[PDB]
Paper text:
The asymmetric unit (AU) of the P212121 crystal showed an uneven stoichiometry of the two subunits, which contained two MetCa (α subunit) and four MetCb (β subunit) molecules. The hexamer was composed as a centrosymmetric dimer of trimers in which a MetCa and two MetCb molecules were arranged in a head-to-tail manner. MetCa and MetCb share 34% identity in their amino acid sequences, whereas their overall architectures were found to be basically identical (rms deviation of 1.94 Å for 321 Cα atoms), and exhibited the canonical three-layer alpha-beta-alpha fold of the arginase protein superfamily. MetCa had an additional N-terminal loop (T8–G26, average B-factor of 25.7) contributing to the interaction with another MetCa subunit through a hydrophobic interface. In contrast, an extended C-terminal loop of MetCb was located on the MetCa-MetCb interface, and it also stabilized the N-terminal structure of MetCb that capped the substrate-binding cavity of MetCa. Although the corresponding regions in both MetCa and MetCb were folded in a similar conformation, only the active site of MetCa contained a bimetallic center coordinated by four Asp (D183, D187, D276 and D278) and two His (H158 and H185) residues. A glycerol molecule from the crystal buffer was bound in the active site of MetCa and coordinated to the two metal ions. In contrast, no electron density for metal ion was observed in the corresponding region of the subunit MetCb. This was likely due to the mutations in five of the six conserved metal ion coordinating residues in MetCb. An unexpected discovery from the crystal structure of the holoenzyme is that the active site cavity within the head domain of MetCa is capped by the tail domain of a MetCb subunit.
Numbering used by the authors:
A (entry chain E): 6 to 24, 28 to 344
B (entry chain D): 25 to 335
C (entry chain C): 6 to 24, 28 to 345
D (entry chain F): 25 to 329
E (entry chain B), F (entry chain A): 8 to 357
The structure:
Amino acid sequence: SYAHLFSPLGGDAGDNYRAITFLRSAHVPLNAEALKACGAKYAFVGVPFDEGNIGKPGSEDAPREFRLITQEYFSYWFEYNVDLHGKAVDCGDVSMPKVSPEVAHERIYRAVREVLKSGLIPIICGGDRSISITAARALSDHIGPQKKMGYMHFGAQLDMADSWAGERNLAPCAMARITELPNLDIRNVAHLGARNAMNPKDHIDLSKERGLQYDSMFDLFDAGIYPLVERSIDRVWSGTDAQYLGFNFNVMDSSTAPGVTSTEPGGLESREMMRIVDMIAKRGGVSVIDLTELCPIFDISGTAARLAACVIMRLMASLAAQDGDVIDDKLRRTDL
Amino acid sequence: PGLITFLRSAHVPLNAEALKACGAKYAFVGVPFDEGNIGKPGSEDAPREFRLITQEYFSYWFEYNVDLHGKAVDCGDVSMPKVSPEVAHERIYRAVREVLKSGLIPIICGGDRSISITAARALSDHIGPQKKMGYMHFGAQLDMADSWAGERNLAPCAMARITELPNLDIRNVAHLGARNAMNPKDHIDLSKERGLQYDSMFDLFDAGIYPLVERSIDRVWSGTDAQYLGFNFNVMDSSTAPGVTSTEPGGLESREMMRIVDMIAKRGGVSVIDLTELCPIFDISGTAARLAACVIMRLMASLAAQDGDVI
Amino acid sequence: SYAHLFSPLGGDAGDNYRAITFLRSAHVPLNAEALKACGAKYAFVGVPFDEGNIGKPGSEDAPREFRLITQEYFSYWFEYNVDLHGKAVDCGDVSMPKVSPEVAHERIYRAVREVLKSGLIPIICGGDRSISITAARALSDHIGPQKKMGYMHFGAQLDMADSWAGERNLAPCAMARITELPNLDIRNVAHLGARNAMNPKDHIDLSKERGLQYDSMFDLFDAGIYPLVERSIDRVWSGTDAQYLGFNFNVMDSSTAPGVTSTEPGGLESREMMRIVDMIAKRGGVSVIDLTELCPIFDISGTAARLAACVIMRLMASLAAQDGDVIDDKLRRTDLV
Amino acid sequence: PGLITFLRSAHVPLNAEALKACGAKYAFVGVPFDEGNIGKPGSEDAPREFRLITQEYFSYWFEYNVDLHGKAVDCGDVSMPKVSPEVAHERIYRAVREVLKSGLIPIICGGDRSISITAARALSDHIGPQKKMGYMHFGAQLDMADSWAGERNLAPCAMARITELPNLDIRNVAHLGARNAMNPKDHIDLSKERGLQYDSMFDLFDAGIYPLVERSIDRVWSGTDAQYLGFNFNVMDSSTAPGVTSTEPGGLESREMMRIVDMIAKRGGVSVIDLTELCPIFDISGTAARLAACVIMRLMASLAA
Amino acid sequence: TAKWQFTPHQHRGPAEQFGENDHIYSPKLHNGSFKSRGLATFMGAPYCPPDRHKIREMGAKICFLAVPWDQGQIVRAGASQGAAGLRDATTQYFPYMFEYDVDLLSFFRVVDCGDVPTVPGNNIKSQEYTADYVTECLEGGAKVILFGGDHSLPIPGAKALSRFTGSGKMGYLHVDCHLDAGPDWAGNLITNCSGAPRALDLPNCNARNMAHMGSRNSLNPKDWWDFYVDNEIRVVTMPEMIERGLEVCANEIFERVKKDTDSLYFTWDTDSIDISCMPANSAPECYGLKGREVIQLARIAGRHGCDILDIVELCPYFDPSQISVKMTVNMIYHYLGSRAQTLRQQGKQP
Amino acid sequence: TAKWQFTPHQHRGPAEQFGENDHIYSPKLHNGSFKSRGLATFMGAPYCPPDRHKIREMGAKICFLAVPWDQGQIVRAGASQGAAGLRDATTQYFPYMFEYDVDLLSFFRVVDCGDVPTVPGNNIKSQEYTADYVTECLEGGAKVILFGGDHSLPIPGAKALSRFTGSGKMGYLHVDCHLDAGPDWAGNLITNCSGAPRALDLPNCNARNMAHMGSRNSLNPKDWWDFYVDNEIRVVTMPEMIERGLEVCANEIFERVKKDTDSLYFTWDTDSIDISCMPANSAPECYGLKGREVIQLARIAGRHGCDILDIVELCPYFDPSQISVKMTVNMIYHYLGSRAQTLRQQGKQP
Ligand SMILES: [Mn+2]
Ligand SMILES: [Mn+2]
Ligand SMILES: [Mn+2]
Ligand SMILES: [Mn+2]
């Protein structure tokens, strides 16, 4: 069936595209056999967990809001001649009712391992940044000690606290734990967007001690943004067997993503990020995609959530185009 | 995990066989349709916000020793095209008929008050011309326009259409709460001409509320084979129902409606429940949506207690 | 001076009552010596802690909003002929930057014991309901094994979870911990306002098993509200040496208190609560006053916070009137200068 | 601990001796006065909201390797009566003189743009008739009403009063960002009659912004003994300054104002900083207040570097 | 000569309606302004400039005049936005009240006189403007509905009514959470906390025809209470209204403020209303009138009648709902519907 | 005979201003409507009913006509509230633009024609009304600014301009995040996603004079793209605008849609604007025009000129700020200021 490509027909075919799963995809249980059998390339996994956050509360509601906002779009991308229909499934949310944070993280880890076992690309929607520690560890364990991982994250905060209030796996520690993964060489790590007054000196110091070559927002401005992004893309993708890509949309200028846990004006514009998406998609693959720290209670007109969905879906569409996975442009609505 | 449903209930397709097999007594049906609305926009978002608000409540009603778990399922939203009202209404009609066919009670959440026209017609057709229907609606507006802007099935026409149903005797029709100036003279004239014995808010206050409510409950339930119960929460005082399409000062307070719900539940059954005109863009911290949820859930619990369906 | 009783004079005297401390009170450090010397009867203690909350977030910012809202009023109560000026001081907030929940509670405990040692009445503004566990433990320890405590709480939730996610001191556990205090007889415990669909069955079961004589919202309506409130006041105050009084303003109908962590319409009206405040003040004293679960991000026009401030300040004014602590009503603004 | 202060800074009484001894370079002064406002209400709440937003930021600025801890103190709000504008302005005047006496830089947060009239006069009086003042303001409105509704000290008169100060040569005055129709013809006429060389937004875009900003910086700082710098954040594009009294589309973006801050800081000093017309009731998730806070704090960090 | 004329359901052009009573019936050719306000006046009434000659030529017997001034305020600005919310909110109603069987628009020949202009920062001059605009309405033969704006409104409002009343006697009723009887505020005699003492100072307004209803809480400095004690002016606190009932108290006070009077000024602060019904206010207050009691008080006021009704301190920016603006519509409409029903029962003309 | 007359700074009564140029200067006796809107029309212009004879008698050369209809919408209602927000926001500006040295009100003799009435539930009849109201404006001798309302507006709008253009040729420019070229939507040919095919269907609107600018993202079913391919209508996507430059692209496109034409219909969806500057929209979209680019495009449009400008889908209830409504004021005002500057430069008359 191709009816989903086009304006709905009348009669019993009339319906309302916005009246819930990610991009209206089929629901598939978090089971590797089922995921392998459904034909999709991506599995959306909601992680409504915020116990790692030390800042403004609210990310727990982001997966539901993100799902809802994807109903506002069609699966077809005229800019790319690609159709995302059937390319993703929605695995629901990791179940974490009335459990300890250690148990919550165990469930996240098992969920991520299970999707990776299926061969599908997990799209992990938090939830707080701490989820990335667990999901990246799952990727690291999935590929094993003889393979190499690359990691790239966009965000205003480095999250390079060695410890926070006696704890070692809260959100502000996330990169400090991720860069300890044994098959993630620091030369294959990129972090883009760090801002003034969002990064304690100890975070800078630990980054320097470890050789983390983060690209601050000023670094990006000094370089004209794209040439430096391209160099960091090359470091993450060249020579690595798997790549983890994460987003905290506080990388964006505040007016372009108000509904996030923490923000400071002076970040990326949406037109800059959409160019970066194509540059990433040129490399022809990704192993895990995450998004964390959306904060719907602070959003207005769903701005940040719409931006997030448009970036994630554009990335999927641009990857399909780079793969030559395009639809027959001769298809017409009068065929139906 | 990850689906948002009424009271965290199971999703069941809008299919009579599935609904009869699932074991619930109520089927929640979302109707995000607002093209009958003549006032401020926003009720299309009500089914989602209502569902969300119900997620915050436990299903156990300790005062009734009742657990609402398993008593309802959620059929999702009626699928309807935009800018095609006649087709949208046909879709609503078919959905309500299918739930009624299962024997479950539809809980219909609009959307604008026009949907009641169709849902009431579905109940009327379901029971057939040899049976009698009763109808009770709470709201601040009579909605007795024979026509409005030359049109005949908009929200302000709803009662003018519903009271034309051939097996709904006007003596079995109640309308409670009318007040304030969104009630033009022809709505009163048509009510008098047809004998609609509405209980205005002033009349209710003058009577101490409950004795007059009881009299109108008796007219709707006594001698009828099926009863349709509908709410526009602007029947409530604005203070406790701000987020409605047309809020109205000087109405029922939350504890009063809760007492009325128990009076209705004494009758031991209802055939259709609707709620329309919730309007989340105007709400104050979800107060109107919470009031609606508490009224619906309390009616379910009180009906369960009346039936002896306790823990 | 008496100038604070009256509209401001002109010249150098002209100022703006609205332009932050509780009731524009002096700040006094959390130090028993200073508190005993400052002459006040109450010490306001903000507790911006929400790590015990499993529900909607927001209570951490309540103390600041509560202080802000009190700037909206004078210290004089014409209904009572009482002046609250100098009767309270503001001790600031308990400091809890980047610490474990256990350290936070330790700091809360230390703060409350320190105020109690000075002889002042703490007015503790949370923050989540869990802080009540610690504050009640402090009162229990302060009075000692030879004295008896009474406890009265208004709220829609019983908070009688024996444990929650394996934890024992989160907000939904608060009454389960408070009723284990060794000098708090269950017969001197009142809980008013419990609501359907906010109270799981095990919380009811545990209440029944322990003999917690809670007054549900239905019980209150069935009684005409006040006679039952009076019976519960009598149990809390008769025979006890110290009384703890706490509020979760979700006891109020949602229209009167929208900015709270969890609410369901069908609670008390403000005019009922103002009557209740005078009934409590008839007993002539209270040892601790707390308020928790205010949620400013959900408040509209500051409604819940204003209600809370009016209830608390009315209670202080009504207690003063009951003690005969009234001003000279012959004073006039023309006396000034 | 419970007292909300600009940048979590110490509170210091508005007293020259105390301010000189506390070790800070800046003194935050809240001015919740809005009785000169001719537009939508709301700026009276800005000093409180501004303080609150600054609580969210760390004091360390890694690109500058500067920590702002101890650089500022908070003097609280100026005490002013309502419905007595003349007395309120006298109170502002005395507060600004007292801070200037201490040698610290006042950071004055309104409140409405009328406050600038008085604060600028205080600076003018503080340096006295043998010294020269320079004045730079960013905003979408010229505020060049000789009178407005017959009154002479309302917000739209502010530049008409400030450019009458006797030791403020018009060649040492800059006004950047003017655009859109909240600029009636007499404001242009008076600017032309007086020689006010304002840099309109269209002028700025035509020049690539920064070269023109640099010329105006040079006019304000070169040869002057003291410099007053003021912001109405409606100079910014509406997208990044929604919560202001009179928001204006088509203005500076956040990264552009941040660059300009660095250009100003290159001159190594400023005598008074003001920010007026923040309007929290119109803000979107605090965006305008955050922009304002980031501009002020980046200015402090860049000056320290 | 000015003509009193309006379009039923507002819109002109090709789909204009012309029926002389079409405004009391469901709209026929279109939706009127129930969804989109268009260029609505208060009640859809004809606009008439505040000019005694134009008002008298139109035969108008009620003038709606907004006084949005909010810079005579000791609390916080915002009431300048009240009148726009009110006018918008009348599009949600018909001018016909079935509870009274009255067409308010044609019964009173209502006109919307627009807004009184303001001089920002200048409370003295802005109040001089208000008194002069109110005088045009009274001299035009109409009773007046004045919509604030802050509570400084009764100072020019009562002064204009007092001048118009001349050698007769004028009563003054003040309904408010706040006693509003500062002798001065920071030296200023004419802020929004001095309505009552400034009314007493008028040559024909006497303490025996003044009263205050609705007070509670601590935004009430001692001199505001002492004013009532020393002048022996009746004060009905909100707790007294609750204990005795609005009907008893309201009827008693109206009898008192109208006894042997030729005119009555009635000023009504929205803060009298419980904050649960009225969040959009400069200084909103719990422990007030519930919504049904507001409508009852408006009905009681309508039975007795006043010459000027003012309603003050509405701040719509503070309310994300429509409850506050629609409450103020009903204060006015129930007052007018009750007044018309009373006149008609008495065989009297407006 | 109708007279074109207005009061500078709006207020009549004792403090009315009368200077013939007072509306372009700081107000003199009072604050006008900068704080409190009063009874403001668009730009404070005279109201003129949409009637060709009245419009011509006033000499009006621009009619502002709101079309709040938002029930021809396939996304979500809300744009029925746009025109009220827009009119209110014009009180925050003078009608004088110093950037062009033009008094927009006097230059064009602007009038506010009120709103087109609607028939709820009946998209066919509501569009019939809109076309008839627009025809009165065109036949009265004015060019038109049409303010929605949903994006079904260009269907009756272009139909009325096409009718007026007769045997001549009409161009059609559509600026939007969304391609809006559904042949039908659920069988319906005239919803807000079909402006472009309904225009191409007009007998005197030809593909060579049609264009679409601003598109991006995936609310864009394939048939909407296929329409431009199958009819050889030029599409300039937002990424092309960014890459090549707004000025280069917009000038090429205005040259295209005006070439050998007698009139031009220009429809402009607020969603073309980046969501950071325009949250108040039925279908807001990232990756759009930034604020300075909106003004630049309005200026470019004004230099070339259109006969009808419509602006659609503004939903002010979704925005707690004034940014969206004030953006739509500036779209109109910069269009008119640039248009007047160009006419004056060419020695031509509106
Ligand atoms: Mn007052
Ligand atoms: Mn008051
Ligand atoms: Mn469109
Ligand atoms: Mn669009």
